[PDB]
Amino acid sequence: LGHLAKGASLDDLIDSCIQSFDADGNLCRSNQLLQVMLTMHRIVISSAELLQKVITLYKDALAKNSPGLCLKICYFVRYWITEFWVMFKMDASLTDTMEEFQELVKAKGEELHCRLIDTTQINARDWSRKLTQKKRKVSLLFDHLEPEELSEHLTYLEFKSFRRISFSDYQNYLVNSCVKENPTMERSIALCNGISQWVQLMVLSRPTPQLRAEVFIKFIQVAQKLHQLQNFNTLMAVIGGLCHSSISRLKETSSHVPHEINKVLGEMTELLSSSRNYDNYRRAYGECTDFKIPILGVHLKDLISLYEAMPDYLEDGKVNVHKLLALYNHISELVQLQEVAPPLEANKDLVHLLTLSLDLYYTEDEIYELSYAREPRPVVVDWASGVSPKPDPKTISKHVQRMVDSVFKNYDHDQDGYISQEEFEKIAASFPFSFCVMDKDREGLISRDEITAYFMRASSIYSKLGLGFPHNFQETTYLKPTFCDNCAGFLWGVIKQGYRCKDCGMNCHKQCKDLVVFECKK
Amino acid sequence: LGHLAKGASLDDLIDSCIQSFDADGNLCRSNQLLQVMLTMHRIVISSAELLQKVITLYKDALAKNSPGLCLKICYFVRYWITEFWVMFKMDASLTDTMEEFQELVKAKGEELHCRLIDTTQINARDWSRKLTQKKRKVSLLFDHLEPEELSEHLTYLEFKSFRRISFSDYQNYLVNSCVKENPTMERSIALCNGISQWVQLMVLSRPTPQLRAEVFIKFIQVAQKLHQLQNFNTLMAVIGGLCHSSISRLKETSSHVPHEINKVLGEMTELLSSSRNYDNYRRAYGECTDFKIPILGVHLKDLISLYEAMPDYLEDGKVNVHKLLALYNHISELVQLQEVAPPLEANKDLVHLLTLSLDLYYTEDEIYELSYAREPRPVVVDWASGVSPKPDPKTISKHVQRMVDSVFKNYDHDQDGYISQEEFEKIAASFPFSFCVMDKDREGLISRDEITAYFMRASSIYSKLGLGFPHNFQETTYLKPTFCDNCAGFLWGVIKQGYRCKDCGMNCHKQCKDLVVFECKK
Ligand SMILES: [Zn+2]
Ligand SMILES: [Zn+2]
Ligand SMILES: [Zn+2]
Ligand SMILES: [Zn+2]
């Protein structure tokens, strides 16, 4: 390629970038300097300061009275804005320096220069996808569903989650040394951990008899289908959940059920095993063609190792471009994946159900206590968390909303506002250890507000976020015996035994009043 | 009488006491020096030290080789032991000094002297009442009962409570300046306050309509009957409860119901009113013949005023006997009352019910909150408490026991272990604001353990003493949704949601586990 061994001054890297364009605007046949610089520059300096360098360059060249260097500069900038919009949307300082530059070239007001650097039209066209950027029919019931369907929709989820990660996110993860400041990756983490805990809690959810290990079998089948779908990350998630200490400590279940599977589990462990370092996975992933998913944990370890290996600035005082080239190559290799869409089966109701299923935040100790409570007496997804991910009430409230809307459209049959409690129980099976205190309008029928209650309570326990609809409460002295409409329990005391809602007259303990799940207009 | 103006040395008061006896043992025709000394001596010195004076006297007289002075001393002592046993039972130091004296006269072993001072036989005869020291038929239902019956049984109660107070108790109340060390008076206090609060809570207990003021009328009638029965103390209690600020603040009830009564209430207030000082009550009580009750509050104020007026020891260095005479006269006047038994109607089941009804310990603020909750917007029994009386779990546990046994014998009809919930509700009417969380063996029938539960919970709330049968509890992680067998409410949390009983498998919140009312052998 174009060659820098000891590297080069940042000023000259910029100069080269601009000189890759010509007065007519055409771009050089070899761009890789543009690519590497425009993508990686954020490690040496901020994009604001860089743009400022370009501005000093522009004022200079305009004062030199050369239309060609100005035009080239503007074409370079236009290319920056057009080819990476994301950097501009996310970065505030960059956008403000862009407005500054625009107002500068407008105040000077020389012809086409202004037209070339406009953000407005590009921004307009970017938000311009109103439409997304007869299917098939699947069921929301976990008890009867096929492991391939589960693996498929989990792969859809994981793939979207991955796609959300961008070049600049990897760059940011490299510069900040793993802060949760950058959301996309955190969401992928939540998704992985959530899948693991979903597996573990789903196994523990079933009653003491055989059935738990039947669920075990079913998740191992899901794992197989994930393997054949070449989705390695969620594969690591489900196996990592099946191999966890709390699930591994159930001997009765292990002893109950079949061998072929245990052999398969051995195979999945040995495959996914971390013997230094994940070489089995490295070669497995090597033979994979077309659609694939990275297990981005080890790849991020690779990125970090690369970042720490090479010095950012060289001892010569110049910029080390070997580093920027290497990181660009690795990150580009990763982003490359998101171009190929998954083979199959987009169904968004099941997606809604799973996105809600998979929001789980639990202590290891809690799960050990459940597992131990059920049974009296090492393949690690990590990606080691120095900090655990935390839940966002907005995405979870949307999740519940979408879940309700979907279970409504699918299973209501336009019949009343209700669905049969049998089908509901079957859907509930897909939510481990989920229960909500309520009393029902009809026997064997569930209101929309009632199911919203159930899922809101479920999500409230799962995310460990107490949340509920606002009521106007007033501390009330109850003269006749009365019970909590939230926790279904007696209000103790002589006086001031609870809180009454002014408008709807709902009765609650002080503890239950903030977390009440039902609406005030009852 | 025998005359001391400036009073006399304690040694000489003792000498006189002994000299009132003769060698043959016969007692002087005028004893009042014996009476006053033997009763009141505890204010100048303890009975132990006094007995020790008698012992030095005995050793001295025996060494003087005079059989008459020894015999007289022994006869005096025998009279002390025989005529006041209570002083000897209650006082430990006295009893031990008595054993010392007995072992002394036994070690010297001179004839009859030992026989004369023996405590054993007197003690034997004192405990010797195995029998108490066809009636009539009354009902345990408050809704239909006659004000005269209520006033009658309340008078029985108050009279027993009063009888419990002894000479030495008044003396002790005089010396310690009102410490709750002496129980009998404290019990009378509890009884008065309990009656007041029973009145107030009974009025507040009924629903918002007219009926509360009907109960008001009924208590005013009870008050009238108490007046005609010449029972002034509980009269003061019930009127004092009817005139309380919390009951007086109900205007709707006042406006609802009749005048003749309000005139009568005016009469009861003006009578019982404290205009200095209670002269109306003084003359009312003056015209009273035979059976009467003191309103011992003002009389104790009289005793205190007497005690503070006169100097214990005179400036001459001698004992002021004017004081001892005055206090003896007043206290003797009081004790005199307990000799005449009340005119009527001993029924111990209703007594059991009332003794349990009347154990109440409430904050003024609590009752103000109930009264205020029912109604949105000065004749004082006191006897001012610098310290409020506190409940004793033993007497309350016995109370419940006796209550259950009585409601069992009376209302069961030897039919199953159950009584109808209608009759039970009617009995419950007599316990204001009383409720207990349970579920029942049979619809419309109540177990003996069930009613024991109800009354134990009622008493637990009333006395503000949490109490319950012991279970062996173990902190339990519940895998399936479950509810508190005590508070009838949901057990929150992922893990460690409650406590399970090892033997009977009872489920409870941590808060409910100590206060569980049912037995473990279920
Ligand atoms: Zn509650
Ligand atoms: Zn409300
Ligand atoms: Zn409870
Ligand atoms: Zn038990």
Number of strands of chain A: 5
The global form of chain A is globular
SS-derived structural category of chain A: mainly alpha
- Could you give a short account of the major beta sheet of chain A? 3 strands, antiparallel
**Tally of alpha and pi helices of chain A:** 24
Oligomer: homodimer
Report how far apart the termini of chain A are. 72 Å
Bound molecules: zinc ion
Strand content of chain A: under 5%
CATH topology of the largest domain in chain A: the name is Son of Sevenless (SoS) protein, Chain S, domain 2
> Which chains share the greatest interface?
A-B, 27 and 27 residues
Helical residue percent band of chain A: 55-70%
Determine and state the CATH class of the largest domain in chain A: Mainly Alpha
Order of helices and strands of chain A: HHHHHHHHHHHHHHHHHHHHHHEHEHEEE
Q: Strand order of the main beta sheet of chain A, please?
A: 3-4-5
Q: Please, how many domains of chain A?
A: 4
CATH architecture of the largest domain in chain A: Orthogonal Bundle
Radius of gyration of chain A: 29 Å
CATH superfamily of the largest domain in chain A, by name, is Ras guanine-nucleotide exchange factors catalytic domain
Subunit structure (chains A, B): Homodimer. Forms a signaling complex with DGKZ and HRAS. Interacts with F-actin. Interacts with SKAP1.
GO molecular function (chains A, B): calcium ion binding; diacylglycerol binding; guanyl-nucleotide exchange factor activity; identical protein binding; lipid binding; phosphatidylcholine binding; zinc ion binding
Family (chains A, B): Belongs to the RASGRP family.
Main location (chains A, B): cytoplasm
